[PDB]
Amino acid sequence: AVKHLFVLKFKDEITEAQKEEFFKTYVNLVNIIPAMKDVYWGKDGYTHIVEVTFESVETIQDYIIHPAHVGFGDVYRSFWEKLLIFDYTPRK
């Protein structure tokens, strides 16, 4: 099982309630995007972390071009100053 992990910094103008709303609405994408298996997010100049579980590297791409994900980006991309993305298979 693979992970889609991303790390974010919000723009200064974004309020605390807005950041909270951002993650709540993101997590709700589990209700719309079949590829998303689980999501967790957290707050520790990056401040926030999001981890999504996927069946495979293939299913990650299904999430990427899903119309709800594209829609989320269009509404919310303006919230972040900068973002890093990582896709990988956890191993020990």
Next chain:
Amino acid sequence: AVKHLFVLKFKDEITEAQKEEFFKTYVNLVNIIPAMKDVYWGKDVTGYTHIVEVTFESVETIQDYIIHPAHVGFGDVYRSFWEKLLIFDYTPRK
């Protein structure tokens, strides 16, 4: 339960043998440092190339890990392997 996450880029000269020993030694710290509950690492397939996630009981046990001599030892030996590093400590939530 809290998460210790770090993301790294190795310096260009670092070999595949050095990289594997690096994660092999780091993963092995679970057996030495009680605070470390589990570890997984991965290489990005999409700057930063590698991901390491450590699970801890709480933020208190993270500090036990931080000053543990085996952890300090890992840092002294292996810190020269990485060009850049980001560290995050956070509680996962939904």
